[PDB]
């Protein structure tokens, strides 16, 4: 399991990144989700790694 | 070229339209075509 | 000053209409082309203006015949 925190804002970002952040369950900034360690979630994190903090 | 009508020689029905060159074919074209009224092939002639 | 150009024709919307591995129903158009850029395969027919269409129900497969050419088939 791993913990995911939205650190940056979505204003000014493209639609694909907003959709990816939506599918991760994250809402407002500084909000947190806890997920599993599938390759699917890792692919999501790779797409938006500049907007988010990941903690094992 | 000109436009042509083909008439059935057994009914007088005008079943087909086609084209031809009048200099190359100055006669009246004859072709054997299906006649819908008689439901068989009949000789058709230009009008 | 004048251009003496400015004409074009309407686009004809060519290319692939169905995907590889997709289920398709009989009579569906698979590909639109000028010439046989792709050949008809098994259960696939070629139209009067080179259109490739499905003749049965099945799944579409784009395949490679001898080295330089391609074809498309439909398998139930």
């Amino acid at each position: 399991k791993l913990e995911i925190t939205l650190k940056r804002s979505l204003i000014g970002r493209p639609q694909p990144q907003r959709k990816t952040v939506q599918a991760l369950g994250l809402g407002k900034t500084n909000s947190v989700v806890v997920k599993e360690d599938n390759p699917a979630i890792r692919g999501m994190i790779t797409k938006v790694s500049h907007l988010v903090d990941v903690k094992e | 070229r000109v436009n042509i009508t083909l008439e059935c020689t057994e009914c007088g029905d005008r079943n087909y339209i086609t084209t031809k060159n009048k200099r190359e074919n100055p006669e009246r074209i004859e072709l054997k075509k299906y006649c819908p009224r008689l439901r068989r092939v009949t000789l058709h002639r230009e009008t | 000053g004048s251009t003496s150009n400015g004409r074009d024709s309407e686009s004809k919307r060519l290319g692939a209409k169905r995907a590889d591995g997709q289920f398709v129903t009989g009579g569906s158009i698979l590909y639109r082309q000028r010439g046989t850029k792709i050949y008809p395969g098994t259960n696939v027919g070629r139209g009067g203006d080179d259109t490739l269409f499905a003749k049965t129900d099945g799944v579409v497969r784009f395949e490679r015949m001898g080295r330089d050419k391609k074809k498309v088939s439909v398998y139930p």
Partner: protein, 133 residues
């Protein structure tokens, strides 16, 4: 230097991204001018540079020009507005990317070669350097 004929009279201007595709080495003579930057080079500039560097050597040795002005460019006169089609062709140009050898010489000693290439490089709109095979 003008092409004898062309397939089209008008052409896009293009771009000059990247290092030169080929011709970055001295291949015929002993000395060469190499481009350090990219630039359009017209046929007047080529002719002026060639005459300077050939006159300094007193028609001794050999000179190779490694670029040709294949592309044409157009223009519009003063007083015409925008529109009404493309303008009329004016001249011929060669786009030269960085790293391209554009002049080579042979048949003369170090001093004559280097001074002739220095005299030639002052006629060109691009920043150059002198290289030896």
């Amino acid at each position: 230097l003008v092409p004898k004929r062309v397939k089209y009279r008008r052409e896009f201007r293009g771009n000059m991204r990247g290092r030169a595709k080929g011709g970055t080495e001295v291949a015929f003579g002993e000395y060469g001018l190499q481009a350090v930057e990219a630039s359009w080079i017209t046929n007047r500039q080529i002719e002026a540079a060639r005459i300077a560097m050939t006159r300094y050597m007193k028609r001794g040795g050999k000179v190779w020009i490694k670029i040709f002005p294949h592309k044409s460019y157009t223009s519009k006169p003063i007083g015409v507005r925008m529109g009404k089609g493309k303008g009329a062709p004016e001249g011929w140009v060669s786009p030269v990317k960085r790293g391209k050898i554009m002049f080579e010489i042979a048949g003369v000693p170090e001093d004559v070669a280097r001074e002739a290439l220095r005299l030639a490089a002052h006629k060109l709109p691009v920043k150059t350097k002198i290289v030896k095979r």
